[PDB]
């Protein structure tokens, strides 16, 4: 109840913090992925809204 610790010196610290900000922008060709070069497949895919 009557003792205190006081610093008599200091230190300058440089720390590193890494934060993600953005990610990969991707695009998908639905017809090419599902029905790549196929007219019958494309016509059937039109049925799915």
């Amino acid at each position: 109840n009557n003792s205190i610790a006081i610093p008599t010196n200091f230190t300058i610290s440089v720390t590193t913090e890494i934060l993600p900000v953005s990610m990969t922008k991707t695009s998908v060709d639905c017809t090419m992925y599902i029905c790549g070069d196929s007219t019958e497949c494309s016509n059937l895919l039109l049925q799915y809204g």
Partner: protein
Amino acid sequence: NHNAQALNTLVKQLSSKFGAISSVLNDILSRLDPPEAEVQIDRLITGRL
């Protein structure tokens, strides 16, 4: 606008056949016997779900 567009898209999804003969349940029931009609109704149910 996003919420309204989501609801409108959900409504417009009801016109899709999803591979069935028709997108209308009443037409499927009227044009087919129960056992065959069950298959088309299953396709519509899966699509709408």
